[PDB]
Amino acid sequence: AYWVQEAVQPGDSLADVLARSGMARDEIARITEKYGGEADLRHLRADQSVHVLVGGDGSAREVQFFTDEDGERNLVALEKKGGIWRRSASDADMKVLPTLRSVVVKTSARGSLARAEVPVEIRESLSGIFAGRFSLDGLKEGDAVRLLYDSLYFHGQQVAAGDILAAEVVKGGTTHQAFYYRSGGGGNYYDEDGRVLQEKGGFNIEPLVYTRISSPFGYRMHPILHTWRLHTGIDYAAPQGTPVRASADGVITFKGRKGGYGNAVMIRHANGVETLYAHLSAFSQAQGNVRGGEVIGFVGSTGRSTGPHLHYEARINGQPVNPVSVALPTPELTQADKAAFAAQKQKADALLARLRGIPVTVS
Ligand SMILES: [Zn+2]
What we know:
The chain is of the alpha+beta class. It has helices at 14-20, 25-35, 109-115, 120-130, 335-356; strands spanning 2-7, 49-54, 60-69, 72-81, 84-87, 94-104, 144-154, 157-171, 174-181, 188-190, 212-215, 218-221, 228-231, 234-237, 243-245, 250-257, 263-268, 273-280, 282-283, 289-290, 295-298, 309-316, 319-321. The protein is built from five helices and 23 strands. Strands 11, 14, 16, 17, 18, 20, 22 and 23 form an eight-stranded antiparallel beta sheet that branches. Strands 1, 2, 3, 4, 5, 12 and 13 form a seven-stranded antiparallel beta sheet that branches. It is globular and about 60 Å long. It is classed as hydrolase.
């Protein structure tokens, strides 16, 4: 038994990829007939590789791939049980593993990170996190990037990257650090002193007054089904018609129906950052240039939505990232939180510090 990963090319159906990985047409039919009516298997996104576990005989035992809907990515994990295709449904299937990287830039940050196999999710989040302290494209030969992040493994196969837990960038001899601190939304990023990393202006407001965050950005395991789903933004539950505001100055690049996002507004900000405001009930008169705080629309349940909520999504260079401390203001910590933060960051700091003493990429 051994694994194979077949890269998804634009226009590929699940069948095309499985066929190209050498799987028999009969086997492909069985998979498409059984799950083709629960997820789009006819048009997969080419941002991944389909994983297939092939037994000694040469027949498939397990297939792993992501299906996409506007606002989410569902891990379709199938496995033969008694020779019958079933959805993997074990809370032991996925492991979330801490991963550490130390990269020394040769010509560019993004290229050196790409070479070290740092996933695009992580490269673009890193760029967003330090935006207020320095630009990532400004790193030169000799500069260094150290990362501690969650890596998601399904039956031993790395399928996705989770949150950055800690990051250190040494630029022109200056050390910049960011630590993830959490205590129903995710955490926030603070520097080594528990202070906000973001610039004075930029993203100074949440896009609305809301009841509660019904779903943060990130990978979540379904409590009963044990299936995995990436939420590509934050769902803020709020009453129908609640005003929605541009989180920062920018230019509106889209206003209208956007598939499963329903009524949506897209804003282009600086630094390749875009914000998306989805499921709106209505638009405002905002057009072209917008100011942070300007009303751009109103909460609804248009598109793929059960109840009223704003789906808020941040994209850096086209990649959806966790909006916290990137396209949202970071709340300042109280002296109490600063203490709890200092204690919680000691483990991550020890790891970054140990790799600092190494003058080349660790590999
Ligand atoms: Zn959503």
